[PDB]
């Protein structure tokens, strides 16, 4: 519902209007398949010694 | 005045920043990504004065 006015009608439009707005990852880079499902994980590292 | 001079200086040499084709998220059947480059910045002397 955010409000931007718009140039050539004069009028103020929506968001909605001139985008999609969603809710989803920050970085869609990696991906896991644990036994072909998906579904996520992270890898444990230790200290050197 | 120098504020123009500076201004428009700053302006025609941009540094266009570097993008990807084809990034996540993807179309479904996407075959082919591929980096691309815009160069925004001026060359030499001629295009500067």
Known sequence: ?49 | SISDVNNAIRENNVEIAPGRLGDLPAEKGQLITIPLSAQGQLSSLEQFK
């Open chain 1, 1 to 49: 519902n955010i409000s931007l006015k718009s140039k050539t009608n004069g009028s103020v439009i929506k968001l909605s209007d001139v985008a999609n707005v969603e809710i989803g990852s920050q970085a869609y880079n990696f991906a896991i398949l644990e036994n072909g499902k998906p579904a996520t994980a992270a890898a444990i590292q230790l200290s050197p010694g």
